[PDB]
């Protein structure tokens, strides 16, 4: 899984090297940034439910047809709405995993790999999840470098969907 | 390859759960101990050649049959391979120290190594002795109280000792 | 040339990726550590001559035969002593390059690549340059993390010679 | 590949000289501006898909002949290649921004690219227009005064503008 | 471009062979089927405009939000509606190219290669073009093996979108 | 890879014998049924995406543990792999339908697959359920009496059912 | 084994494709041509013995030395003549296999692969088997496209011997 | 690689236009002539070894300097290469005959061949003579009135003659 | 790969000992017999094609089931493979004859060959018969008293017989 | 071209080595054997014409049909007989080249490479040239190690034809 | 790659002629001089490291700009490459000495080398000086009258001098 | 192990060839040279002890610091002197192995492979072993081609150390 530390190791191992000061500096950057990262991850975790519920409505307001149009891909039945909130929670949970791990590793492995084929096969529009992510980004209530950390991983998600 | 942080993530995701307050606090402490960890890694790496050589010399002094004609470390080719293995093991041990997790050591170094040695005729018990000596010197270097802010690294030294014993257990 | 920054770029480019927060953290570690690195590089640069002259004698004291034994590889003629001080200066200069660049790049390219063949072809003992480096390490007069930076690159040199 | 720091080193070594006080001070300032540089890179990368798409849409609106039957960006394969080039160029531009030196851009992206386009029949002047638009949006995003500690990044924006113009000059 | 003939040649050339009766039979199958293929291609070509206009409305009826929702990806402005009918015509034209060439070659090269990246980058839903293709398939007015030929290439398009 | 015709040839050559009148008549009937075979193949291939998706949705509805956190089809990577396997199996089944012989399916798809799934931790019994559903839909599509010359394809549908059951048997 | 069908499958599988109309046409060509192919294969099979006996004499008349010259490679002993008629039967049998399979597969695998090394190692002249094949081609008694099928595989044999 | 049908398609798409009635009728005629085309291909391929050998023998009879000591076709290695080239050219010519378009011949056989021969010292004018002879025999075989439904293949023979002259022009 | 001389060296080095007078004399005799050894090798190699063919013909005469329809040497492909194996074995046997040591034969030819034949369905006992015949002819050719300085090569013929029996034992 | 010397060089160059005593010994073997090799090459060269004429008749006596049977492959016309004697001379000349070069190089490059395709394409039987070589071997009139050298390269030719 | 013997053969075959008495005598003399040739090769190879080092030291003493900061032989990497080239050239020169023909040197070492040096910025005139020095020492070592049967090797020394001058001419 | 014979075999096997006269000549060179090689190997073996003891002092006289300077790499303790004489014996023994095997094989495998890493890791100067080899070369007491054989393998050792 890609983190600053595994990237430092991978860099040294690829060339049969012992770690050097070149890589230790990189890890120190991870340790220093962890203070803001943890703060962001804790806050999103503590407020996850309201963010999930708020983001789901943001989608339904942007795309009203998702709650009326008939089909298993839509949130027009109680099951569909449960699938949708579930998915939103997955995205948000992955963001907190990236913050804690210090890198995109968690999202890369669990969510981004295969995303396009899942959205094509199941008739899911990337535009729905971008709206949800845009909502979380605007209403998580973080400031300073905690917001910079959160938004960096949220914008990473939006890019994978674009 | 996982580090201490990704390991928690991978365990939390298998449950489909956000991190708990206990987990958050457990990972904040790792960060707060990061300086000591980097020192240990910098210290052992900066003396890698001495640890290897001095452990090799000691092994051959205690087990002279490895270097006598017919021994597994006789001829410069085999001697070079032997020293190489010692560097390799020490290298992946320092990888584990920095990551805070043994996965890199298990997957890239200790996996199938016991079988490699049995097919070649290399005595794994002698490799373990070589590993135990690198350990003693590595800890002695890493925990040297000179030229460093005073503090307690005992928990860290216990962890490092674990990675070495793991490698020794894997080859024997 | 290997630095924390080129290593971050190389990591993203190898996989056709845009930079991520994973790599930005690594570079921030470089910027934070640069304060101590520059301090070390400046001091060694300012005191380079005395360190070079002191280290050369450390060698001649450890290995007296280098100033009496006959041969072009030895410092038994005015030319040999000039070659020796020159070499010591090269090593020290490379260390300041590593400190400034934040990595082993400079030493890797200019000094370590080909070192064993030069020392074999010209009958130069690695033990002579290890002694010189040991002298510089003990007498550079640095404390705190400035000494940690200096010694890390000096011990990197000794390892390449061992 | 060089960054701003290795570039000085490589110039000093060609002279065989230690760094001067002027050089030391010149590199300390780079460090002291590091935060702003990382922001620029984080900001442009976090909106890479918008810069590309919005620049592509604008180019085809101003030059509709590229997408009409017979155009160089007609068919989804060619359109995908065109968008790809735009992502590639923006990617290596952000590499240069982080390194503080254009070498990565010159060596890995702009070297021989003008000849590639001439052999394929791709109008390089239209690529430059695409590049100039990504630039305007990138700077506009990077220098947005909202949600960031106030300060002067003008020198940095001039540098970023240089990497874009360099790519535009290289393809035209 | 992939046709039964180029596939026959490619098969012999890959192994440095002269053509054999094995490949001539395959081409004879192409010549025999061409009678139905041409019939289908002519009819779609003759009625292309009404099929294009009918299919565009099928989409707008299935997805009313495409004519009201604001954004460049939608057909809510005169320009958007012109882009949409244009795209539908592209799909239909490609189908007639496949019929004439006796294979999927034309659609593979001109339309399918890169389709997913164009639809992602420009916020175009595959579901819109599937509906249009479903309309063309149901209302082209062909019978017998002419319909089998037409539908085979139309269903090939739908599969590439699914 | 053999088809129905080469299979007879390979059996006749092992005997060193010319074909018999029974064999000639047996192969003429295959030809006389060729139109129906091509229809079946065209029909199943033209709806491959629906068969896969609809079978996947049904499987996860009946076995929701495969997609819950910790499930073998949890995460988009594993879900994509799972759908991929379903496409692969359906693809090589249609290969067998066209050739009139299962050899391509056995050699290129079902050979060693059971062991692949056991090493990964994928429940083969759940794969078989996925296969049985693709079968039901495939036959339902292939034997649809609409828009086709009326006739009896029952013998052909029994054969197709055999290739699916063979794949299901091979993975369970 | 190479047939029109296995060639169609091999073409789709090489690129991880489902079969397309491009390949179905090729197989339809096989089914249409099978009527003439079977007719040829049946006739050669029914008259195989007389063709084998007639062809063997054609050889012995063209190359009288094969029945007088001494050596195991020749038909100058009862055993040699039995080997020769056997070989001729092999060739003819292979031709009927190609007709039935719709391709050169059977001859490629069972006869052509290794032919040059067998004829060199055992001192067998390709000219003997070309004469036999020329006899079968002229006296099989087929007309129309049945003759075209037979001769195409017989001339394929002669080419492998030339 | 294009055939006669894809060529029209590629020209129509560059215009973004559907096919015209003239084009449809032009391609229907190709189909209606398909039987004759297959005969030509079957006939030339079934006598490929004779065309090659007989053309080679004639060339060396008219130009004995190619096979005398020092000649470009002297030694069995060079003679084998020469015969090989003749087979290769005839092979790709028959490819063009079947496709109804020379693209396969141009792209895979005649592209850069003239330069290959100049670098090796092979006289291209002698290769052209070899090609012109294969042509005469190929047409003579393809247009033989015996054992075939009577009809006019003159237009087809003119086309075949074109592919040969194209190869001859390309090497000289 | 060892020869007769390196074999002694490798045995002496495992003891860490210089060569003894017995070893020196043992190796001088090998040299003094070198002419006879080269003759044997030249003689068997100069008739390799006859040994193979004549042994193949004899095997199939005694075991006609190998070449009847269904036999392991039926079809030209299998027959060519069979003759190939015979050439390969004879080739590596002559390698051993020249080196004075079987290592090349064991390592490069007989290692794992028995398993190869069992997986393919090739009767190893029939291969041994083929080997025993090549042996008889090889010795008969090598020890022919005609056209050679008279002398005693019996010890050499016994050695050669050993390499053949070793190959026969390895495949059966 | 393969000789003992080029083989010695090729062995050292393949591994980026300077020549060693291992390779010098091999070349000394070439120089020592050259005395017998030259003797053989001179004698065959001096008596080449009678050997060529004698060998041609050996063939015509073994295979009388080569002087009566009609075809360009046979020696039944003045031209054919001139081609045949020419070929025999080529073989004999190549043997003297191998003797002089100390290896099979000359025959490998000029004669053996492509031999099977020339004999197949032009309907030439390897059995004719084996007979000619057998004649030269029996009637060259050499003794001792000169005969061993000559026969070794003649038997090398026969093996390439078998 | 040709040696002195194959060169004559290749010239005779281009004429289609047997060797002449003059050629036979010309090649017998080469053989009769073989001992001296092997000595030269053994002598130069046994002192290869001294020739290289001593020539390198002399070059840098006469041209100190090559090793000063900015010089083409400055840094250990470039210095190692420079010494490497010197070993490579000496290696292929000794190849030519043993073969009696320069072809190996021309084809594998001097072909395109002048262009390699111009693209890198390496002064070829300085390489030639390095070559001329290896020559003087090589001849001095090869023609040393001590510890060798007395005789005249002057013709051989002239040839060796030619291979060196050829390499020097090729790089300058 | 590299000898003239294994090199001859390796050359033929690399190309799937039967041995030829090209390789037999090379082996004959080995057999002819073996007379001088054995003579050299016997003499060095018989006088090995005095040569070992004489060479050890040559080193100690050239490099007096090796018997006074403190460290495990030096011969300043009874153990160090035992290691040194041991090493010298290894070198001399390897030379006799090369003479007997007719090639550098024994030294390549047992001594040269890994030599640089052993001398670097254990602080052993190549200059010490070159002096010892120079002593053995000057005092082995061989003449004629026996000396040429011995010195060729001794100079091979010195080159590996330079
Ligand atoms: C010009 C681009 C705009 C601007 C930038 C700006 N930032 C600061 C201060 C900070 N910027 C960062 C950002 C990072 N540090 C890192 O390590 C990383 C990678 C993970 C990032 C993205 C940080 C941490 C700081 C310090 C804390 C803070 O918020 O201040 C300044 C002030 C000068 C300085 O260097 O501190 C400026 C000017 N501000 C603008 O108005 C421009 C539009």
Tab-separated table of C-alpha atoms in Angstrom, chain E residues 48-110:
chain	number	residue	atom	x	y	z
E	48	UNK	CA	-30.737	8.010	-41.751
E	49	UNK	CA	-32.202	11.469	-41.106
E	50	UNK	CA	-35.556	10.301	-39.736
E	51	UNK	CA	-33.797	7.655	-37.644
E	52	UNK	CA	-31.419	10.307	-36.274
E	53	UNK	CA	-34.277	12.688	-35.443
E	54	UNK	CA	-36.429	9.928	-33.967
E	55	UNK	CA	-33.565	8.582	-31.862
E	56	UNK	CA	-32.680	12.014	-30.478
E	57	UNK	CA	-36.221	12.418	-29.136
E	58	UNK	CA	-36.218	8.899	-27.716
E	59	UNK	CA	-33.263	10.056	-25.608
E	60	UNK	CA	-34.881	13.353	-24.619
E	61	UNK	CA	-38.057	11.486	-23.646
E	62	UNK	CA	-36.166	8.863	-21.620
E	63	UNK	CA	-33.945	11.489	-19.939
E	64	UNK	CA	-35.938	14.746	-19.798
E	65	UNK	CA	-33.265	16.304	-17.581
E	66	UNK	CA	-30.901	16.378	-20.580
E	67	UNK	CA	-32.980	19.223	-22.087
E	68	UNK	CA	-33.440	21.291	-18.893
E	69	UNK	CA	-30.390	20.765	-16.682
E	70	UNK	CA	-27.665	23.375	-17.133
E	71	UNK	CA	-24.192	22.418	-18.318
E	72	UNK	CA	-22.227	22.002	-21.525
E	73	UNK	CA	-22.652	18.215	-21.374
E	74	UNK	CA	-26.434	18.505	-21.811
E	75	UNK	CA	-28.746	19.283	-24.725
E	76	UNK	CA	-30.324	22.246	-22.927
E	77	UNK	CA	-29.048	24.815	-25.453
E	78	UNK	CA	-29.267	24.893	-29.263
E	79	UNK	CA	-25.576	23.994	-29.380
E	80	UNK	CA	-26.007	20.981	-27.111
E	81	UNK	CA	-28.876	19.594	-29.187
E	82	UNK	CA	-26.726	20.003	-32.306
E	83	UNK	CA	-23.870	18.097	-30.659
E	84	UNK	CA	-26.292	15.336	-29.653
E	85	UNK	CA	-27.865	14.773	-33.071
E	86	UNK	CA	-24.341	14.926	-34.514
E	87	UNK	CA	-23.197	12.147	-32.174
E	88	UNK	CA	-26.215	9.979	-32.983
E	89	UNK	CA	-25.456	10.405	-36.678
E	90	UNK	CA	-21.859	9.347	-36.025
E	91	UNK	CA	-23.037	6.109	-34.400
E	92	UNK	CA	-25.474	5.327	-37.218
E	93	UNK	CA	-22.906	6.179	-39.896
E	94	UNK	CA	-20.389	3.851	-38.233
E	95	UNK	CA	-22.945	1.026	-38.342
E	96	UNK	CA	-23.299	1.402	-42.105
E	97	UNK	CA	-19.488	1.342	-42.349
E	98	UNK	CA	-19.367	-1.972	-40.473
E	99	UNK	CA	-22.044	-3.425	-42.754
E	100	UNK	CA	-20.163	-2.366	-45.885
E	101	UNK	CA	-16.745	-3.484	-44.612
E	102	UNK	CA	-18.159	-6.796	-43.364
E	103	UNK	CA	-16.743	-6.346	-39.882
E	104	UNK	CA	-16.399	-4.196	-36.800
E	105	UNK	CA	-13.217	-2.554	-38.097
E	106	UNK	CA	-14.715	0.875	-38.794
E	107	UNK	CA	-16.422	1.160	-35.412
E	108	UNK	CA	-13.364	-0.201	-33.579
E	109	UNK	CA	-11.012	2.426	-35.002
E	110	UNK	CA	-13.210	5.522	-35.325
